[PDB]
Amino acid sequence: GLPKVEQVLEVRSVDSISMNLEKRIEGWNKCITRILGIPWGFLIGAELTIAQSRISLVNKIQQVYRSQGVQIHNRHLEIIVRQITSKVLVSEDGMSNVFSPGELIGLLRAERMGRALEEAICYRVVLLGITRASLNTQSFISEAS
Amino acid sequence: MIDRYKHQQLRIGSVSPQQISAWATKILPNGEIVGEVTKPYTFHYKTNKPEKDGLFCERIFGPIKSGICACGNYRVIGDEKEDPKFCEQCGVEFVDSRIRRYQMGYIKLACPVTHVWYLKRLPSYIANLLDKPLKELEGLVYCDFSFARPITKKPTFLRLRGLFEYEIQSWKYSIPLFFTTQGFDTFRNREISTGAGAIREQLADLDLRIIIENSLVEWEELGEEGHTGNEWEDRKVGRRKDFLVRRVELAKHFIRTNIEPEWMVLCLLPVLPPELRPIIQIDGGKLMSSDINELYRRVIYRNNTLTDLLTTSRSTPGELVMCQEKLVQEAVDTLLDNGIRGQPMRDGHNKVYKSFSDVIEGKEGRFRETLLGKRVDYSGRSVIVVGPSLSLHRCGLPREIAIELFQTFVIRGLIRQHLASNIGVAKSKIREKEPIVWEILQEVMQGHPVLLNRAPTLHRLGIQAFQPVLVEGRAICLHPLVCKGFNADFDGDQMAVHVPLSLEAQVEARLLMFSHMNLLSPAIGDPISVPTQDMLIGLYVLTSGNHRGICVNRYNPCNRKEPFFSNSYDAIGAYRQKRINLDSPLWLRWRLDQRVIASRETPIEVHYESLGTFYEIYGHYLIVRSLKKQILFIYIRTTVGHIALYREIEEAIQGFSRAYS
Amino acid sequence: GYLTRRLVEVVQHIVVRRTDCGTARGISVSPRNGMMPERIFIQTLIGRV
Amino acid sequence: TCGIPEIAFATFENMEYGEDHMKPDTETYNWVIQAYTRAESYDRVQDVAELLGMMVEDHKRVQPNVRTYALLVECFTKYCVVREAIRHFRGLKNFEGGTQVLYNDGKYGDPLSLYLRALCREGRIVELLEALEAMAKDNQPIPPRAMILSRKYRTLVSSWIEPLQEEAELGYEIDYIARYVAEGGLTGDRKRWVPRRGKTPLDPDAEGFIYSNPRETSFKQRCLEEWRLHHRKLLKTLHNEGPSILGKISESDYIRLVERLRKIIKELDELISRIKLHEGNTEFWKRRFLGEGDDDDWFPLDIQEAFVEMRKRNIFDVSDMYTITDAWGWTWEKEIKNKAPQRWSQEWEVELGIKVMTKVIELGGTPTIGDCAVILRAAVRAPMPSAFLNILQTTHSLGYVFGSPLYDEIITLCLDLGELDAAIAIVADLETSGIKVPDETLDRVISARQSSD
RNA sequence: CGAGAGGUA
DNA sequence: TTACCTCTCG
Ligand SMILES: [Mg+2]
C-alpha cells in the first residue's frame, strides 16, 4: 500500500528497499577499485550503480500499483526517479581548490570534470530521499523554503 | 531559433548598520533628522493620538489621515507646487497614509547584541569562524565572564593573553589609580573584554586568508594514524576533521561575497512599519494590540534604562551595567526567535510569545498561507444538482449568483443603452429587480465562459470551464458525464465559480479548458467521460438479447422469427405502434457488406436447388446466392434494440457533417 | 496529500524546453531480461521514440 | 565583456542543443571561458572545468587553438590549482607566438607574470626552468611584476633556495636608512606594512590571485614531498593489487618491502625498480574492461560479468574511454608519468641556480646583489668551487661589488681544496674590477702558487 | 482580532 | 488533508 511507496521513495536506508541491492552496491565498490584505474573506475562504478538502482526502484513501486489494479505509465515514475538518483558525493580523501571534501555535485558534471582533470575526484553515488532532494536545489526562495 | 531572453534575479543578504539607518532616515525643512523612536509610548492614554517618539508616531512613520498634519489643518496632496513637505510646526509628509504601511524606523542600542540563528545551530556560523570552543564563546555571551586578549590587531602592555576568566580579583583598582583617567580605558579596551562587544571586535579584526592557511595545515596533519583505532577515537578524529572543512568554506565565501563578518552582532535594530502591527485599540477584540508591540516595548525599555544608567552613574560599578546588559539581550532574542533556546518567555496568562521566525514558518507562515494562495473577488459558491438535459459545454448558474458576479458588466450595458444616467443611477435599477436588468444580464453572459472547481482538487480535471446558462432556483446544474473528473456526487457536495476578466484569460478558457478538449485522462490515456450508471443499464438492456431455446419454446421445435422488414425505419416504427416488443426476433434486409460481428461458424444448413440458387443458413444470417455466384440477398436476424443503437451512432456522425456545411 | 505535496516539489521545475537534446543513447527493452508478460512489454513501449 | 557570466551561457545553450547549422565552434567555447575567467564575484572554477569537459567530449568535431590554451592557464593559475596549469602550458609553447597571447598587453593582471610567480612559490623550478626558457624563443621581456620582498633578497632567481625569507650576508651590514630613502623618503609612496582591518591582502604579491598566493615551499621540501608520492603509489598498487606478484621470491621479499615502504614515507631493490603502475595508459585499462587483460532483473554479481552485461545492454562501451590526452592528441605526456623522481642534492641546486641567472639576465631582469649573495652562500655549504668564478664575475657584471670578507673566505676554500688556479683567476679579475684583494690572503696565495710550482 | 468548541462534504 | 459553517470567550 501507500506506506510502502513512501518508504521506497524516501530512501532512508538503501538496503531497506532491497537486500539483494545493498549487497551489490557495497560489493561493487570494494571490488571495482582494484580492477580499474582512477580516471575510469569511479565513472564505470557510478554507471553500474545508477543503472541497477533505477531498474529496481521503478519496479518496486510498480509492483505495488499493479497488485491493486491501478495502471500508471512509466514515464511519469521515471521523471521522479531521476531526481532521486542524479547526484554524487565527493569523498573525505578529496581536497583540492576545485572540490571540497563533502559536497554534492551532479553526475554529469562530475563525469565531465573527471575526463578533463587529472586531479583525483573521488565520488560515489548517493540515493537521496524525496525530502532531502528538495533541500538541495538552485532556488532558495521556494524550492528550498 | 534565437531564444527570447529574460534575466531576473533575487538576492538575499545580511545588512550593515549604516543601511538600517538609511532605510529609516529623513532630513526636514528645518534640516533636522527624524527616525529614531525612543519612547515606548503607543498612541496616548485615552487620547487616541499617536505620541511623539512613539511606536506609532506620525512624524517618523508618516501621516495617519491624508493631508491632515499634526496640527490639524488640511492641505491638498496631489499638489506639491506650494506645499511644505514638512510643516514648520511639525514633520508632516503630507502625501499619503500608505506610507505607514511601508515606512521603517530604527532603534539605537547602547550595547552590542548577538543574533540568535548564527549562534543557535550546532554548526554555529560564528563558532565555525572563531575556531574556539563553543562553550567559551557562549559563556561570555550569556554569563559574566571576561576575555583578556580581545584584539590581536594592536599591541598591548599587559600580557596575560588570557581567555574568558571569571575572576576580576586581580588588582584592578590600583591599576586604575596608577593609570591615568582613561589611560586604563585604552588599556582595558585593548585587553579586558565583556558582553558581545568582544565578539564583535574579535570578529572584526580577523585574517581570513590566514585562517585558511592554518586550517588546511591542521586538516592535513589530522588523519595521521587515521582509521586505525578504537571506535570511540575515530569518531572524534572525524568530527574535528569536518569542522575544519566547514570553517574553510565559510571563510572563502566571505572573501568573495561583499558581506562583512561583524554584521552578525547588531548595533542598530530595525522596526516594522506601524500598520503591519495594527495594535488597534483592543475595543473588545482583546487581542487587537499586537504581541509585536508588546515585545517591542521591553527592548525599548531596558535599553533606555541602560543609556541613562551609564550617563547618570559613571560612579556605579560595572555590576549595575552588567546586570542590565543581559536583560537587553534577552528581549531582542525573544523578538527575533523565541523558543530557539527553549525559554518559554511567556506571560503567565499568555501563550509563549510569537517570535518573528514563527510568523514566517509553516502552513500559516507567510509563504504558505499568503504567497501560494489567496482569496479572490468575482467568485461564488452553491450546492450542485444533476441537470440531465444540458449539453457538455454548458452549465446552469443560479441568477442571484450571476447578478453579483457580472454586475460591472451590466452597469456598462445600462449606461450604453442609455437606460440610466450615472453609475449610481444604475445600481438602483439593479436593486428593484426591474425586468430589464434581466435582459441585459442575458446578453452579457452569452459568449463569456466561467470556471468551476470542487474542493479537494486532486487533479487537473478538478477545474473545468463552461458556458453559463441562467437558471431560476439556487443550485448549480452540472452535466451528468463530468462528475467523474470532479469526483462529484449529488448528496451535499458544493462548488465554486470564478469569472475570467481579461481578454487573454478568456481565450485560454475557451480554447484550453473545456470538456470537449479534455476527454482523456493524464495517467495512461483512458477515457474519463464514459456512460456510467443508469445510462449503462439502458444500453445493456437494449443489447441484451432474447431467450433462445428451451426458454422460448416448450416443446421441441422439430415436431412442427416471423417479421421481415425492409428498412430499419419500419422496424423502429413497429416498436412504437406496439406491433413488436424489444426482444422479439426479426429479419432485416442488409444492402451493405457483412459487418456483423459473429463467430467463425460454418453454415448450419445449405439448401441447394436444381435450377441453381443456393440458400445458406447461418445462425444470425441468410445469404442467397445464384449460379453466376452473385449474392442476391443478405438478411440479418436481430432485435429492435440492436438497430436503435446503430442508428444513433450513425445519425450523429452524419448530422455533425451536415451542420458544418 | 502529504505524498502528493512532496512529489510535486521535487519535480516542479521540469518543463519541455527543447526539441532535441542530441543524445545517441537509449535504454534497451527485451521481452526477456525479466520475465515479462506481453502486456508489460507493450505498455512500456507505447509512446516512445 | 558584460561582467555577468550567465548571459553568455544562455547564448551557448541555445547553440549546443540546437540544429547543426547553429552548433558551437572553437571560437565559441573560448568566448564563454573568458566570461567565467574574467569575472569578479564568485568561485566560477567548477564551471570552467565542466565546460572544458564538454569540449573534450566533442573532440572529433572541435580541436583547441592558442587562445584556448591561453585562457585556460589564466584560470587555473589565478585560482591556485597550479598542477593543471602546467599541463596546459605544454601546449601553448608548442604554438608560436604564444607568449604574446598569454600576456595580453598586461591588461588583466599580467597572467604570464602570475604563472611564473606561482611556479616559484611552489618550488616547481624544474618547470620554471622550462618556462623561463620558453619565453626566450619568443623575444618577450620578463614583465615588471617580478618584485622584491620586504627583505629585498627575494627575487625569482634567489627565492627557491632553502634558507627562506632571510637577508643574504653581504659582508657590510645592509644600510637600513639607505633602503628607506630609496623607496620613499621626504615625499613619496612606500607600502608601509601596517596591518589594517579591510580585506585587501597586505602582500602586494597577492594581488591578482582570487583568494590568496600559493603557500611557500623550498625546492628541497618539495622534492622530498614529490618523492614520497611516487613511492606511495607503488605501495598503493601493493596494497590492493600487490599482495600477489609474478616473482617467486616474493614471500620473503614481501615482509621486507612492506616495512620498508612504510619507512620511506616516515635485497629486492631491483624488484621495486621493476614494479610499475600504468597510469595515463588508457589502453591498459581498456583491456581490463574487455576482460581480455527476488528473481527480477538483477545484474550479475561478479564485477567482470557485469562488464559483459554493461556491454550487451549498451550502457558503456570501449569507445567511451578517452580523456584530454587522447582527445586533444598530445603525445608528450606518456614519457613523463612513468619515471620516478631525482632525489634532492645541494649540488643539484647549484646548476639550476646558475642557469636561471643567465636567462633572467638575458631577458632583461635586474637581480639584486642580495639575490646573488643567496646563490653564493649556498655554493659554500657543499663545496662547489667552480661556481665561484662565474658568479662573482656576474655580480660585478651587474655593476655590484661585494664586501671583502666573503670574498676571502671562498678564496680560502679554494686553497683548502687545492684550487689555487681558481684563486689566481679571481685575483686577476678582482684587479680588473678594481676592488682590492685582502693583502694577507694575497701573500698566502702567492705562497700557495710557489708550493705548486 | 487571538484562542476554544460543535458540525458539513 | 483540503475546503465549508456556527458559536463562545477573555
Ligand atoms: Mg458527496
Asked if D411 and D445 touch (Cβ cutoff 8 Å), the reply is yes
Alpha-carbon distance of D439 to D444, in angstroms, equals 9
Q: Write phi, then psi, for D251 (nearest 5 degrees).
A: -60, -45
Alpha-carbon distance of B69 to B48, in angstroms, equals 15
Q: Beta B450-454 vs B463-471: how paired, if at all?
A: antiparallel
- Nearest CB partner across the interface for D201, out of B205, B209, B252: B209
- Touching B (3+ Cβ pairs <8 A), the chains are A, D
Alpha-carbon distance of B640 to B586, in angstroms, equals 8
Asked if D209 and D75 touch (Cβ cutoff 8 Å), the reply is no
Alpha-carbon distance of A34 to A45, in angstroms, equals 12
Alpha-carbon distance of B192 to B501, in angstroms, equals 69
User: Residue D399 class from Cβ within 10 Å (0-12 exposed, 13-18 middle, 19+ buried)?
Assistant: exposed
Q: Beta B631-638 vs B586-589: how paired, if at all?
A: antiparallel
SS3 content of chain B, % helix, strand, coil (to 5): 40, 15, 50
Asked if B521 and A71 touch (Cβ cutoff 8 Å), the reply is no
H-helix or E-strand spanning residue B265: strand B265-271
- Nearest residue to nucleotide E9, by CA–C1' distance, is B493
Alpha-carbon distance of D442 to D419, in angstroms, equals 15
**Distance between the alpha carbon (CA) of A138 and the C1' atom of F4, Å:** 38
DSSP class of residue D215 equals P
Q: Beta B564-565 vs B586-589: how paired, if at all?
A: parallel
Asked if B332 and B296 touch (Cβ cutoff 8 Å), the reply is no
User: Residue B211 class from Cβ within 10 Å (0-12 exposed, 13-18 middle, 19+ buried)?
Assistant: buried
Computed on alpha carbons and rounded to an integer, the radius of gyration of chain C in Å comes to 16
The grid coordinates listed for B323 are 546586570
Compute CA C41 distance to the chain's CA centroid, rounded to the nearest angstrom. 13
Cβ distance of D313 and C21 shorter than 8 Å: no
User: Angle at CA D208, nearest 5°, toward D204 and D214?
Assistant: 80
User: Angle at CA A127, nearest 5°, toward A125 and A132?
Assistant: 125
The single residue listed with the C-alpha cell 498634519 is B69
Asked if B402 and B470 touch (Cβ cutoff 8 Å), the reply is yes
Side chain identity at D207, as an amino acid letter? Answer: E
Q: What is the torsional sign of CA A93, A98, A104, A107?
A: negative
User: Residue B65 class from Cβ within 10 Å (0-12 exposed, 13-18 middle, 19+ buried)?
Assistant: exposed
C-alpha distances in Å from residue B272, one per residue of B187, B287, B367, D100 = 40, 18, 18, 59
C-alpha distances in Å from residue B84, one per residue of B72, B95, D237 = 15, 11, 86
Q: Write phi, then psi, for A29 (nearest 5 degrees).
A: -65, -40
Q: Is A2 helix (H, G, I), strand (E, B) or coil?
A: helix
The grid coordinates listed for B100 are 505607514
Q: Is B422 helix (H, G, I), strand (E, B) or coil?
A: coil
Touching check for D97 and chain A: CB below 8 Å?
no
Question: Under 8 Å CB-to-CB from A64, ≥6 apart: which residues?
Answer: A1, A4, A5
Alpha helices of B229-276 — where are they, by DSSP H? 231-257
For the beta carbon of residue C12, count every other beta carbon within 10 angstroms.
Answer: 12
DSSP result, B440-472: HHHHHTTT--EEEEESS--SGGGEEEEEEEEES
D369-381 helix and D385-397 helix, angle to the nearest 10 degrees: 170
Query: What was the experiment behind these coordinates?
Result: cryo-EM
User: Residue B514 class from Cβ within 10 Å (0-12 exposed, 13-18 middle, 19+ buried)?
Assistant: middle
Side chain identity at D110, as an amino acid letter? Answer: D
Buried b (16+ CB within 10 A) or exposed e, D110-124: bbbbbbbbbbbbbbb
Question: How far does residue B307's CA lie from ligand 1's centre (Å)?
Answer: 66
Q: Name the region of B185 (left: φ>0; alpha: ψ -120 to 50; beta: rest).
A: alpha
Dihedral angle computed from the Cα positions of residues A88, A90, A92 and A94, in that order, rounded to the nearest 10 degrees: 160
State which residue of chain A sits closest to B216, comparing Cα positions: A95
Question: How far does residue A1's CA lie from ligand 1's centre (Å)?
Answer: 25
Side chain identity at D168, as an amino acid letter? Answer: A
Alpha-carbon distance of B366 to B369, in angstroms, equals 5
Question: Under 8 Å CB-to-CB from D425, ≥6 apart: which residues?
Answer: D389
Alpha-carbon distance of D229 to D227, in angstroms, equals 5
Cβ distance of A5 and C10 shorter than 8 Å: no
Q: Beta B379-385 vs B494-498: how paired, if at all?
A: antiparallel
Q: Which residues pair with B384 in a beta bridge?
A: B476
Residues shown for chain D: 453
Question: How far does residue B497's CA lie from ligand 1's centre (Å)?
Answer: 18
- Nearest CB partner across the interface for C9, out of A6, A9, A134: A134
C-alpha distances in Å from residue B56, one per residue of B1, B161, B312, C15 = 57, 49, 28, 48
Dihedral angle computed from the Cα positions of residues B334, B336, B338 and B340, in that order, rounded to the nearest 10 degrees: -130
Chain E nucleotides reached by a protein CB under 7 Å: 1-2, 8-9
Alpha-carbon distance of A132 to A135, in angstroms, equals 5
Alpha-carbon distance of B74 to B476, in angstroms, equals 52
DSSP result, B166-177: S---SS-SHHHH
C-alpha distances in Å from residue A38, one per residue of A35, A42, A86, B209, D234 = 10, 7, 21, 32, 14
Q: Most A CBs within 10 Å: which of D48, D76, D84, D283, as the mutation test of the A interface?
A: D84
The grid coordinates listed for D147 are 618584485
Q: What is the 3-state secondary structure (H, E, C) of C1-47?
A: CHHHHHHHHHCCCCCCCCCCCCCCCCCCCCCCCCCCCHHHHHHHHCC
Alpha-carbon distance of B522 to B263, in angstroms, equals 52
Side chain identity at B61, as an amino acid letter? Answer: F
Alpha-carbon distance of D275 to D277, in angstroms, equals 7
> Which residue in B518, B519, B520 sits closest to B509, CA to CA?
B518
Residues after which a C–N gap over 2.5 Å breaks chain B: 560
Q: Is B536 helix (H, G, I), strand (E, B) or coil?
A: helix
**Distance between the alpha carbon (CA) of B492 and the C1' atom of F5, Å:** 13
Our separate counts of H helices and E strands in chain A read 7, 3
The grid coordinates listed for B618 are 447461418
Alpha-carbon distance of B120 to D442, in angstroms, equals 78
> Which residue in B215, B217, B203 sits closest to B248, CA to CA?
B215
Question: Under 8 Å CB-to-CB from B126, ≥6 apart: which residues?
Answer: B114, B118, B119, B137, B199, B203, B264
Q: Which residues pair with B106 in a beta bridge?
A: B36, B270
Computed on alpha carbons and rounded to an integer, the radius of gyration of chain D in Å comes to 28
> Which residue in B116, B37, B123 sits closest to B356, CA to CA?
B116
Q: Chain A to chain C, count of Cβ pairs less than 8 Å apart?
A: 31
H-helix or E-strand spanning residue B383: strand B379-385
Alpha-carbon distance of B185 to B191, in angstroms, equals 10
Q: What is the torsional sign of CA B399, B405, B409, B415?
A: positive
H-helix or E-strand spanning residue B605: strand B605-608
Alpha-carbon distance of B319 to B305, in angstroms, equals 14
H-helix or E-strand spanning residue A39: helix A38-67
The grid coordinates listed for B219 are 586538516
The single residue listed with the C-alpha cell 439556487 is B474
Q: What is the torsional sign of CA B580, B585, B590, B594?
A: positive
- Nearest CB partner across the interface for C34, out of D16, D17, D296: D296
Question: Under 8 Å CB-to-CB from D151, ≥6 apart: which residues?
Answer: D165, D166, D167, D370
Residues belonging to chain C with any Cβ–Cβ distance to chain A shorter than 8 Å: 3, 6-7, 9-14, 34, 43-44, 47
> Which residue in D382, D381, D376, D378 sits closest to D398, CA to CA?
D376
H-helix or E-strand spanning residue B108: strand B105-114
**Distance between the alpha carbon (CA) of B290 and the C1' atom of E3, Å:** 15
B491 is annotated as contributing to ligand binding? yes
- Nearest CB partner across the interface for A79, out of C3, C6, C11: C11
> Which residue in D59, D65, D285, C22 sits closest to A116, CA to CA?
D59
**Distance between the alpha carbon (CA) of D295 and the C1' atom of F7, Å:** 62
Side chain identity at B541, as an amino acid letter? Answer: V
Asked if D65 and D28 touch (Cβ cutoff 8 Å), the reply is no
Question: How far does residue C5's CA lie from ligand 1's centre (Å)?
Answer: 24
Chain F nucleotides reached by a protein CB under 7 Å: 1-5, 10
H-helix or E-strand spanning residue D371: helix D369-381
**Distance between the alpha carbon (CA) of B277 and the C1' atom of F10, Å:** 21
Computed on alpha carbons and rounded to an integer, the radius of gyration of chain A in Å comes to 17
Q: Long-range contacts for C30-33 (Cβ within 8 Å, ≥24 apart)?
A: C33/D297
Computed on alpha carbons and rounded to an integer, the radius of gyration of chain B in Å comes to 43
> Which residue in D213, D219, D199 sits closest to D149, CA to CA?
D213
Q: Chain A to chain D, count of Cβ pairs less than 8 Å apart?
A: 100
> Which residue in B417, B392, B398 sits closest to B529, CA to CA?
B392
C-alpha distances in Å from residue D108, one per residue of D71, D72, D87, D104 = 12, 14, 22, 7
Question: How far does residue D128's CA lie from ligand 1's centre (Å)?
Answer: 83
Alpha-carbon distance of D333 to D86, in angstroms, equals 12
- Nearest residue to nucleotide E8, by CA–C1' distance, is B492
